[PDB]
């Protein structure tokens, strides 16, 4: 009963391209000789070999020591002379950053979005029955300074590592001249289908589908449009038909309304997915088919009680992940199944929310949101700025392309209008774009840092919060977009374990964060509980960064911003199991760390648990019972005496045993262990599929040694391309046929080639027997440059999960408008400045002598601990009245850019216990947006003073 076959064929266009990392003249020409170019397959990036190999700069400056410029791709392919009268479209999921596409030497156009799909009609230039050639000229250049990088201001490693090339999938679509259109607004100006659900209950739901159809034949067509609703088992549950005439050359939208009896609704704990099959028929003959996703759900982001879905209230907890999503050794060009692997890990740790930061996810990643039940906050392209001119035009156009592409996915609940407040006129345009292309989705709209412009009031539909600060729009629901900025490397367990190039790292004193995995894990509850978890009005939100990546960070001991709860090769940190124990709905306990300590060790043991009480045992001797968890989920046990053997925690709800975890002391190292991980279809010989290999050091019992480290050397043979892994704490650790073990394990990637065959990887380590794994890359159905086999992903992932069995108990200035501070320390607003008042929140230093104009001013007691911290939005407020702004800045600190841009030097100084602070003066009008960043732009003296702010009404 399900309509399957038609004139439409979707080809995978990833396999077998020619590539060159340069800009040769006439590279788009039909008869350009590309024989010496490199044979690759998409997804592909030429920055896989020169990223994750530079130690972080800190100061939120991302990795810039990588190749940037103009490169070229060329692909040969032949369509059957059979298809001689078919439309042919090419679709690019994304190209980074500027793409120019050519077909047989004819330029089709450019796309500068870097992260949004686009496509072109090849038909007028195709030679059927002959070889055709696509050429893609790609540029990934960007201006050095993230504030002077126009127009593509989102294109900067500050937020988005500039990994260039065709880093997502490419498809070829062939179809009848009479066809449903493709949702690639750039540059086809078509929108495909629009699916929305109304009058939803458990009993009934009405699905409206508007199908845009185009008749590119020279004669009118009388057609029947069929809308089929297909459930999770592939059964047709309901259908609708409409008989319409499409005049020759015309586009029209055909609407159907189809009722579903007893719909399976879409929940975060049961993301039931329907599919809509749209078919064009010409009397029993099927001309075209197109499939659209369908998840049926009612929802409410409520200002008082958080988020509801289908009448159940659900706390949202998940991650903010970079769209680059890069994998060490591979860059941003993840095969879809590695994107699925990343997503399955978020799902494993209880995620039900995702924000892409700060450009759109790939298409398959929105499919993964759909099938794992992730409420999604989706941006188009953005950096961190109110934009204008051409920057706004390109970004706004990308926003339309984005809605046209993604509007039918049920995982999307909020359109992120931007990663900064915007002008009133631009808010109008944002709502007008949603009204044009998504009038019926009931999605909300917000911008992060909307609170820094009065423009946002009355336009944003949901407060997009930062770092769990107090709500600034109590009329609205609130969702957290980026909380917990901390970093910590996977390889450091705790201060009771031997150091692994961290506490003694040459760069350790430049780190903002010097946390072990245990501290990083345990504090996950501090951050979550106090910023979202304990607030019944708070919908929840996104933990900043899921996987380590070389975007801007604060720890030059690492080659990434180490803020993920898994590392850049998706090895989980203890913090991953902390969040998993807090956020999963079933009862959980997780003992933080390991059980290989020295004889006589005494340490605090942390159990993370969503249970009500936890019991702790050392070799079956009960050492404690805790019914008073800290921050909802931390059951700690002080001064536990280590004993070789076994440590076991028990989790209880209502004094009934729910779950148990045991960790064991490992024995001495005894062998290397190699374990392979491939995609669900196996390792495919397509030139880009990846096989992962876990290399471990194990004891005689086969348990991973948590303290093992040291260099392993590798050899590879067979048709494959070694891509290595990384060591977070070391430069130039990528590519090499050797790698250090960290806490007993590391992970390398092997990429296939077009030739299928047997591939052998051997690992060696002094003192161990050699070990090996044998892989087989499997042949794919490939011919004339084309395959109908789509990129492999995990299928049939639908299961039902229960609601949590236990949730921890929850508790009971006219000038500094919308003040907020995002440094690690605490700021404090205070009034009536004069001699004797404290200058900082974390010191007892007082102001003594003051220039006359400073007295009676309102002031911000800043935390001196943030004296070398940097954040774009460190300190902000809207000027409540016309006022004087004074910034006291340590003379020993290089003046930061925001100070020199908008503040003049007074000549006067204010001495505060030996430190001379120059006053900088600024007059602000009422409503002016006052944004302050780090004390210094780069390095500074370790013992310098954090700056302070003073404010007085103009009068
Ligand atoms: Br990244
Ligand atoms: Mg994180």
Residue 352: which CATH number?
A: 3.20.20.80
d(CA 333, ligand 2 centre) in Å? 21
Q: Which ligand is nearest to the Cα of residue 161, counting in written order?
A: 1
d(CA 40, ligand 1 centre) in Å? 22
Q: Which ligand is nearest to the Cα of residue 542, counting in written order?
A: 2
DSSP string, 791-843: PP---------PPPS---------SEEEEEE-SSS--EEE----TT-BSBSSS
Resolution of the determined structure in angstroms stands at 2.4
**255 upstream amide cis, omega within 30 of 0:** no
- The answer to whether residues 607 and 636 touch, using CB atoms and an 8 Å cutoff, is yes
231 to 272, 373, 413, 952: CA distances (angstroms): 9, 17, 22, 64
717: left (phi over 0), alpha (psi -120 to 50) or beta: beta
Q: Which ligand is nearest to the Cα of residue 575, counting in written order?
A: 2
d(CA 384, ligand 2 centre) in Å? 19
- The answer to whether residues 91 and 182 touch, using CB atoms and an 8 Å cutoff, is yes
* 28 vs 107: CA distance, rounded Å: 8
Helix (H) or strand (E) holding 222: strand 221-230
d(CA 771, ligand 2 centre) in Å? 35
Tell me the three state secondary structure of residue 733.
coil
d(CA 875, ligand 2 centre) in Å? 22
Give the chain's end-to-end CA distance (angstroms, integer).
77
DSSP state of 476: S
Owning domain of residue 468: 299-583
Q: Which ligand is nearest to the Cα of residue 324, counting in written order?
A: 1
* 358 vs 355: CA distance, rounded Å: 8
233 to 196, 208, 798: CA distances (angstroms): 21, 22, 11
- The answer to whether residues 323 and 115 touch, using CB atoms and an 8 Å cutoff, is yes
Spatial CB neighbours of 132, under 8 Å, sequence gap ≥ 6:
76, 77, 78, 79, 103, 104, 122, 126
Spatial CB neighbours of 923, under 8 Å, sequence gap ≥ 6:
882, 883, 884, 885, 954
Give the torsion through C-alpha atoms of 356, 358, 362, 368, to 10 deg.
0
d(CA 520, ligand 2 centre) in Å? 10
The residues carrying an active-site annotation are 482
Query: Was 727 annotated as part of a binding site?
Result: no
Beta bridge partners of 840: 862
* 683 vs 753: CA distance, rounded Å: 11
* 865 vs 219: CA distance, rounded Å: 75
Query: Was 885 annotated as part of a binding site?
Result: no
Query: Was 565 annotated as part of a binding site?
Result: yes
- The answer to whether residues 160 and 561 touch, using CB atoms and an 8 Å cutoff, is no
């Amino acid at each position: 009963e399900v309509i399957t076959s038609s004139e439409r064929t979707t080809y995978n266009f990833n396999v077998d391209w020619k590539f060159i990392k340069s800009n040769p003249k006439q590279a788009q020409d039909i008869n350009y000789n590309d024989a010496t170019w490199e044979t690759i397959s998409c997804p592909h990036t030429f920055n896989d070999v020169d990223t994750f190999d530079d130690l972080s700069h800190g100061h939120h400056d991302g990795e810039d020591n990588q190749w940037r410029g103009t490169v070229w791709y060329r692909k040969h392919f032949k369509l059957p002379k059979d298809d001689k009268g078919k439309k042919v479209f090419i679709e690019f999921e994304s190209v980074r950053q500027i793409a120019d596409v050519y077909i047989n030497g004819v330029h089709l156009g450019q796309n500068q979005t870097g992260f949004i799909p686009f496509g072109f009609d090849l038909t007028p230039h195709l030679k059927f029955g002959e070889e055709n050639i696509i050429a893609v000229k790609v540029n990934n250049d960007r201006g050095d300074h993230f504030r002077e990088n126009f127009p593509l201001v989102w294109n900067h490693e500050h937020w988005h590592p500039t990994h260039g090339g065709i880093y997502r999938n490419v498809f070829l679509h062939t179809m009848d001249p009479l066809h449903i259109t493709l949702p690639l607004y750039d540059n086809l100006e078509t929108v495909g289908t629009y699916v929305y659900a109304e009058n939803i209950s458990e009993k009934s739901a009405d699905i409206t589908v508007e199908t845009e159809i185009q008749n590119e034949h020279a004669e009118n067509k009388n057609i029947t449009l069929v809308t089929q609703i297909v459930d999770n088992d592939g059964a047709v549950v309901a259908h609708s038909n409409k008989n319409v005439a499409i005049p020759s050359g015309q586009k029209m939208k055909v609407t159907t309304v189809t009722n579903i009896q007893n719909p399976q609704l879409w929940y975060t704990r049961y993301p039931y997915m329907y599919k809509v099959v749209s078919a064009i028929k010409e009397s029993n003959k099927v001309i075209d088919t197109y499939e659209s996703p369908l998840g049926i759900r009612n929802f409410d982001f409520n200002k008082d009680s958080g988020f509801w879905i289908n009448g159940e209230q659900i706390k949202l907890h998940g991650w903010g992940q970079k769209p680059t999503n890069a994998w060490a050794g591979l860059g941003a060009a993840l095969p879809d199944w590695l994107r699925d692997f990343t997503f399955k890990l978020m799902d494993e740790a209880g995620g039900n929310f995702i924000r892409w930061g700060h450009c759109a996810a790939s298409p398959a990643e929105v499919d993964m949101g759909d099938k794992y039940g992730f409420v999604t906050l989706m941006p188009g392209v953005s950096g961190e700025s109110e934009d204008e001119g051409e920057t706004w035009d390109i970004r706004y156009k990308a926003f339309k392309d984005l809605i046209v592409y993604y509007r039918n996915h049920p995982s999307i609940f909020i359109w992120e209008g931007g990663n900064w407040a915007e002008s009133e006129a631009h808010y109008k345009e944002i709502l007008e774009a949603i009204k044009t292309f998504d009038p019926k989705g009931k999605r909300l709209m917000g911008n992060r840092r909307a609170d820094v412009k009065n423009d946002s009031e009355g336009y944003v539909s949901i407060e997009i919060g930062t770092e769990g600060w107090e709500r600034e729009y109590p009329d609205l629901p609130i969702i957290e977009s980026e909380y917990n900025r901390e970093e910590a490397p996977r390889r450091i367990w705790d201060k009771n374990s031997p150091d692994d190039n961290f506490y003694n790292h040459p760069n350790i004193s430049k780190n903002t964060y010097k946390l072990s995995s245990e501290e990083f894990a345990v504090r996950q509850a501090d951050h979550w509980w106090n910023k979202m978890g304990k607030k019944a009005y708070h919908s929840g939100g996104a933990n900043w960064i899921f996987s380590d990546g070389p975007h801007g960070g604060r720890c030059p001991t690492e080659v990434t911003r180490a803020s993920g709860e898994v590392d850049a090769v998706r090895l989980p940190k203890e913090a991953f199991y902390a969040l998993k124990a807090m956020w999963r709905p079933e009862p959980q306990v997780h003992i933080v760390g390991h059980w290989n300590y020295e004889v006589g060790t005494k340490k605090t043991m942390y159990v993370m648990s969503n249970c009500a009480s936890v019991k702790l045992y050392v070799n079956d001797k009960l050492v404690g019972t805790n019914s008073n968890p800290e921050n909802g989920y931390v059951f700690k046990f002080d001064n536990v005496a280590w004993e070789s053997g076994k440590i076991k925690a028990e989790g209880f709800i209502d004094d009934a045993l729910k779950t148990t975890q045991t960790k064991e002391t490992t024995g001495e190292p005894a062998a290397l262990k190699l374990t392979s991980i491939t995609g669900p279809e196996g390792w495919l010989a397509d030139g880009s599929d990846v096989a992962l290999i876990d290399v471990e050091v194990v004891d005689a019992q086969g348990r991973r040694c948590p303290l093992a480290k040291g260099r392993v050397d590798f050899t590879i043979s067979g048709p494959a391309i070694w891509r290595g892994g990384y060591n977070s704490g070391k430069p130039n650790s990528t590519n090499n046929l050797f790698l250090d073990i960290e806490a007993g394990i590391n992970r390398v990637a092997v990429r296939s080639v077009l030739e299928s065959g047997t591939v052998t990887i051997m690992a060696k380590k002094p003192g161990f027997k050699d070990v090996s794994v044998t892989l087989k890359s499997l042949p794919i159905d490939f011919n004339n440059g084309l395959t109908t086999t789509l990129p492999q992903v995990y299928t049939n992932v639908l299961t039902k999960e229960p609601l949590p069995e236990h949730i921890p108990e929850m508790p009971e200035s006219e000038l500094f408008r919308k003040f907020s501070y995002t440094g690690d320390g605490k700021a404090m607003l205070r009034t009536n400045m004069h001699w004797g008042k404290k200058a900082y929140t974390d010191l007892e230093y007082n102001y003594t002598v003051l220039p006359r104009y400073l007295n009676e001013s309102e002031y911000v007691r800043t935390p001196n601990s943030d004296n070398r911290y940097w954040a774009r939005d460190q300190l902000q407020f809207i000027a409540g009245k016309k006022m004087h702004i004074y910034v006291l800045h340590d003379d020993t600190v290089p003046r930061p850019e925001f100070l020199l841009r908008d503040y003049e030097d007074t000549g006067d100084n204010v001495n505060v216990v030996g430190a001379s602070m120059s006053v900088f003066h600024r007059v602000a009008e009422e409503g002016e947006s006052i944004i302050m960043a780090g004390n210094s732009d780069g390095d500074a003296p370790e013992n310098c003073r954090m700056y302070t702010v003073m404010v007085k009404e103009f009068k």
